[PDB]
Amino acid sequence: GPDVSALQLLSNSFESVFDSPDDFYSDAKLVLSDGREVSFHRCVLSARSSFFKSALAAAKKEKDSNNTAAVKLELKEIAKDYEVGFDSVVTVLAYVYSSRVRPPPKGVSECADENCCHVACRPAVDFMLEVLYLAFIFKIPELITLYQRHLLDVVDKVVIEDTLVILKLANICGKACMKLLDRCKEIIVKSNVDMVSLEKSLPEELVKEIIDRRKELGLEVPKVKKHVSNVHKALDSDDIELVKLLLKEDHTNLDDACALHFAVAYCNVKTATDLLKLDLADVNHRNPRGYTVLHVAAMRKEPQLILSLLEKGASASEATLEGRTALMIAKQATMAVKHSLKGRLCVEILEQED
Amino acid sequence: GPDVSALQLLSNSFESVFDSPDDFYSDAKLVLSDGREVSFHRCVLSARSSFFKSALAAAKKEKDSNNTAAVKLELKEIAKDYEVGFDSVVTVLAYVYSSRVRPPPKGVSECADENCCHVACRPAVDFMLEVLYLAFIFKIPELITLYQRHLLDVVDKVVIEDTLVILKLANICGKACMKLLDRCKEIIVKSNVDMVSLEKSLPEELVKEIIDRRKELGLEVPKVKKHVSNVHKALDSDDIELVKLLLKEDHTNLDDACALHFAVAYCNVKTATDLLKLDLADVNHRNPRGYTVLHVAAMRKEPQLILSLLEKGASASEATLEGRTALMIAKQATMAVKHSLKGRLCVEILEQED
Ligand SMILES: [Zn+2]
Ligand SMILES: [Zn+2]
């Protein structure tokens, strides 16, 4: 194959261009969220995508460099509608340069557990989400096809509370992720995620689109019981004595509104702290989905809450329907490794009290 | 073929880079002999060849452009051991950029005859020689192999007068072209070309071996004939008094040394002008190769000398030992193309004599 070998040679040459970019007359820089800069050459990213073409063309004249300065592209000020890391950026640029995908570095898409195969857990998933969003915004259709195929293949195993973020990002995209959007939507619909849970962490248009679908399979679950909406809307807006007086006013089973789980998962740490300082609601009374208070406390990655609820005597050895305790929730939430030390501190507490 | 398709897309993108260099932020220009400029981006040619990387690293500080102009590379100062046109440079740059070779524009690898088959005439060989030299000096091994194989399988069909320049360039190139050098050298040695031509059109460190190729593969060819050497060295020195005095003393036959052939081939138009008027020897006599004076005159690109010969009555109806008249020499020796018109001035002069 004389034809293919020359193509291989071109690909290797440009891969060597990317690997050592300082030496080969690199011009521009992409500046990330935290502040890392990745060097690149205007020619190749101008040619390989329309988006960078428009961006560089626009940014040319508005400034003069006199060969003593580059042009900087702020990924925080361009890809506005989501947040991305560093290794995904490296992967996308490496695909642009060398026409092949680069496997992620060690200890990134692997979480903490002993025998978590690292296929569906949180780090692998959100790595895929970051690279898919970057490819969508940068207009590379084939990379869209590949990574959308990956997510669509894995989507069955993942837990619902991450299928939600998958759905959110899929809606962030356009028609490019139509298959993923529809599959994920029909996954969520047949489940039993409560009204408030969808309303809090999904756009209004989409929650309408799903709540008028709930009653279409013949599955009659309307939105009722506006009584607890007062407590929820009164405690999400950071007021405590108000809800104390309200609960003491009508005497309408505070715990039965799952105020503990709601405040632990969606409210702020101070609010949950004072709510647990008050002692008028049970702690092991699990919510309709099947999560106790400390399950979601661990999933939120807040060590102060975990230790405080350990002080309340809540049984930290009771598993959900799937069978996962606080230890394994905390393990599969985190990323194995100037980083986020929250996750690695909660795992320790649940291996201690024995 | 997923893997092949990505490489194909990369190649097409970079070809689209090359085709329109102004839009994709070019940074340097090659400049040819006549003064034509070809735009190129320092990244790709820095990566694809060591020689360009060295040249650019040398030129990176002499002139600080500060976005006032680009850095222009003078080809003569770069590869000064041979001459190169334009379409060959375009072809080599296109191969480097897009990993495939672009055929020359219609009319450059073709002669002016409409009966030739256009596989071994003069421009066809000239194009290949130019591209082979450029590939050798740019250090592009596979292009070397391809064009070397082209010339290698063609060499055994081209008239010896072009085999001489083929060998000259092959000796210019190093051991990269050994399979061409030995082949062409053997073809030359086995022939009956006279020794004076070899002495007059090659370096000495090569003829010193061409002598032994005949003195060792069996034959005893070398003559002496120092007597005519004085006539030769007098005539080639743009003199007439010396040759007249030397030929008026010994009264040696001018037709033995074939002086008209020497004057037409390796002498200026002045000696031809002051010797052809001097009518003392036959015009229709041929050297051991088998060419008349008119044949070499046609091959020389000297229309004025050809009209001078036609004044003196040289028969154009007689054919060489290769079976060719003067018309077809004149036609096949030019190309079918705002340039040096003088090639197509000769063909008419010799044509209408019907
Ligand atoms: Zn895992
Ligand atoms: Zn021809």
Instruction: Give the CATH number for residue A106.
Output: 3.30.710.10
Q: Is A245 on the interface with B (CB under 8 A)?
A: no
The annotation status of B111 as a binding-site residue, yes or no, is yes
Q: Per the CB < 8 Å rule, is B14 touching A142?
A: no
Q: Which residues of A touch B65 (CB under 8 A)?
A: 67
CB A293 within 8 A of CB A260: yes
* Any domain includes B55: yes
Is there a single domain that holds both residue A129 and residue A16?
yes
Cα of A7 to nearest chain B Cα, Å: 6
**How many A from CA of B153 to the centre of ligand 1?**
62
CA-to-CA distance for B166 and B184, rounded, in angstroms? 8
Cα of A86 to nearest chain B Cα, Å: 24
Which residues does A339 contact at the CB level (< 8 Å), separation at least 6?
none
- Size of the A and B interface in Cβ pairs below 8 Å: 78
Is there a single domain that holds both residue A103 and residue A12?
yes
* Any domain includes B134: yes
User: Partners of B74 in the beta sheet?
Assistant: B31
CA-to-CA distance for B171 and B181, rounded, in angstroms? 7
Residues A104, A106, A108, A109, Cα dihedral to 10°: 70
Is there a single domain that holds both residue B145 and residue B74?
no
Q: Per the CB < 8 Å rule, is A7 touching B3?
A: no
CA-to-CA distance for B327 and B331, rounded, in angstroms? 6
Give me A125's structure tokens: 């998933």
Place of tokens 């002499």: B62
Domain count, chain B: 3
Q: Which residues of A touch B11 (CB under 8 A)?
A: 7, 10
CA-to-CA distance for A270 and A267, rounded, in angstroms? 9
Q: Which of residues 13-72 of B touch A (CB under 8 A)?
A: 13-14, 16-17, 24-25, 27, 41-44, 46-48, 56, 64-67
Q: What is the CATH number of the domain that holds A304?
A: 1.25.40.20
Which residues does A167 contact at the CB level (< 8 Å), separation at least 6?
A181, A184, A185, A188, A202, A206
Is there a single domain that holds both residue A12 and residue A106?
yes
Start-end of H helices in chain B:
2-19, 42-48, 50-59, 75-78, 87-98, 122-138, 141-154, 160-172, 178-190, 195-200, 204-216, 226-235, 241-247, 254-257, 259-266, 269-276, 293-299, 303-312, 326-332, 342-351
Q: Per the CB < 8 Å rule, is B47 touching A65?
A: no
CA-to-CA distance for A295 and A319, rounded, in angstroms? 8
Give the residue from A20, A43, A101, A146 with the most B CB atoms within 10 Å of its CB, the best one to mutate. A43
Residue B70 neighbours by CB distance under 10 Å: 15
Is there a single domain that holds both residue A168 and residue A247?
no
Q: Is A4 on the interface with B (CB under 8 A)?
A: yes
Biggest alpha carbon–alpha carbon distance for chain B: 85
Technique that determined the structure:
cryo-EM
Cα of B46 to nearest chain A Cα, Å: 7
Q: Is B142 on the interface with A (CB under 8 A)?
A: yes
The ligand minimizing its distance to the Cα of A118 is 1
What resolution (Å)?
3.8
CB A282 within 8 A of CB A255: yes
CB A89 within 8 A of CB A75: yes
**If residue A37 lies in a helix (H) or strand (E), which one and from where to where?**
strand A37-40
Query: Nearest chain B Cα to A95, which residue?
Result: B6
Residue A91 neighbours by CB distance under 10 Å: 22
> What's the CA angle centered on B231, arms B228 and B233, to 5 degrees?
110
Is there a single domain that holds both residue A163 and residue A270?
no
**If residue A60 lies in a helix (H) or strand (E), which one and from where to where?**
helix A50-61
Which residues does A235 contact at the CB level (< 8 Å), separation at least 6?
A243, A259, A262, A263, A267, A271, A275
**Residue B52 burial by Cβ neighbours in a 10 Å radius (0-12, 13-18, 19+):** buried
Is there a single domain that holds both residue B111 and residue B157?
yes
Helix axes B342-351, B303-312, angle to 10 degrees: 20
User: Partners of B31 in the beta sheet?
Assistant: B37, B74
Cα of A39 to nearest chain B Cα, Å: 13
Phi, psi of B284 (to 5 degrees): -100, 35
Q: Per the CB < 8 Å rule, is A100 touching B6?
A: yes
Q: Which residues of A touch B66 (CB under 8 A)?
A: 66-68
CA-to-CA distance for A261 and A3, rounded, in angstroms? 63
Give me B260's structure tokens: 């008209």
Which residues does A16 contact at the CB level (< 8 Å), separation at least 6?
B47
* Any domain includes B246: no
* Any domain includes A125: yes
Is there a single domain that holds both residue B141 and residue B196?
yes
Pairing of strands A72-74, A28-31: parallel
Number of H helices, E strands in chain A: 18, 3
Q: Per the CB < 8 Å rule, is A99 touching B17?
A: no
Residue B126 neighbours by CB distance under 10 Å: 18
The SS3 of residue A290 is coil
User: Partners of B73 in the beta sheet?
Assistant: B30
CA-to-CA distance for B172 and B17, rounded, in angstroms? 34
B281 to each of A253, A315, B284, how far by Cα in Å? 133, 125, 9
Which residues does B319 contact at the CB level (< 8 Å), separation at least 6?
B325
Closest Cβ–Cβ partner in A7, A44, A68 for B11: A7
B188 to each of B125, B197, B225, B265, B289, how far by Cα in Å? 17, 12, 21, 19, 13
Sign of the alpha-carbon torsion through A293, A295, A296, A300: positive
* Any domain includes B19: yes
* Any domain includes A212: no
Give the residue from A7, A46, A50, A95 with the most B CB atoms within 10 Å of its CB, the best one to mutate. A7
* Any domain includes B255: no
**If residue B73 lies in a helix (H) or strand (E), which one and from where to where?**
strand B71-74
The SS3 of residue B71 is strand
CB B113 within 8 A of CB B329: no
Residue B153 neighbours by CB distance under 10 Å: 9
CA-to-CA distance for B40 and B27, rounded, in angstroms? 7
Residue ranges making up the domain that contains A261: 227-349
CA-to-CA distance for A135 and A144, rounded, in angstroms? 6
CA-to-CA distance for A98 and A48, rounded, in angstroms? 11
B288 to each of A156, B191, B194, B196, B257, how far by Cα in Å? 90, 11, 7, 12, 11
Is there a single domain that holds both residue A269 and residue A171?
no
> What's the CA angle centered on B27, arms A57 and A54, to 5 degrees?
10
CA-to-CA distance for B94 and B103, rounded, in angstroms? 10
Q: Which residues of A touch B24 (CB under 8 A)?
A: 42-43, 46-47
Give me A258's structure tokens: 């799952």
Residue that is last in its domain, among A137, A165, A191:
A191
Phi, psi of B37 (to 5 degrees): -120, 135
CA-to-CA distance for B136 and B228, rounded, in angstroms? 41
Q: Per the CB < 8 Å rule, is B17 touching A67?
A: no
Q: Is A99 on the interface with B (CB under 8 A)?
A: yes
CA-to-CA distance for B52 and B75, rounded, in angstroms? 12
Cα of A264 to nearest chain B Cα, Å: 48
Is there a single domain that holds both residue A137 and residue A68?
yes
Q: Which residues of A are annotated as a binding site?
A: 111, 116, 118, 121
Give me A225's structure tokens: 């019981």
Residue A118 neighbours by CB distance under 10 Å: 16
Which residues does B57 contact at the CB level (< 8 Å), separation at least 6?
none
Residue numbers after which chain B is interrupted (C to N above 2.5 A) read 337
Q: For B120, what's the count of Cα atoms within 13 Å in the CB-facing half-sphere?
A: 12
The annotation status of B116 as a binding-site residue, yes or no, is yes
Is there a single domain that holds both residue A143 and residue A269?
no
**Would residue A66 be called left, alpha or beta, if left means φ above 0 and alpha means ψ between -120 and 50 degrees?**
left
User: Partners of A31 in the beta sheet?
Assistant: A37, A74
Sign of the alpha-carbon torsion through B235, B240, B246, B252: positive
Q: Which residues of B touch A13 (CB under 8 A)?
A: 47-48
Residue that is last in its domain, among A175, A191, A207:
A191
B64 to each of A63, A66, B25, how far by Cα in Å? 20, 10, 18
Q: In what order do the strands lie in the sheet with A28-31?
A: A37-40, A28-31, A72-74
User: Partners of A353 in the beta sheet?
Assistant: none
Residue that is last in its domain, among B172, B197, B222:
B222
Give me B346's structure tokens: 């000769």
**If residue B72 lies in a helix (H) or strand (E), which one and from where to where?**
strand B71-74
CB B5 within 8 A of CB B18: no
Is there a single domain that holds both residue B70 and residue B114?
no
* Any domain includes B193: yes
Give me B121's structure tokens: 């005439």
Give me B172's structure tokens: 């210019």
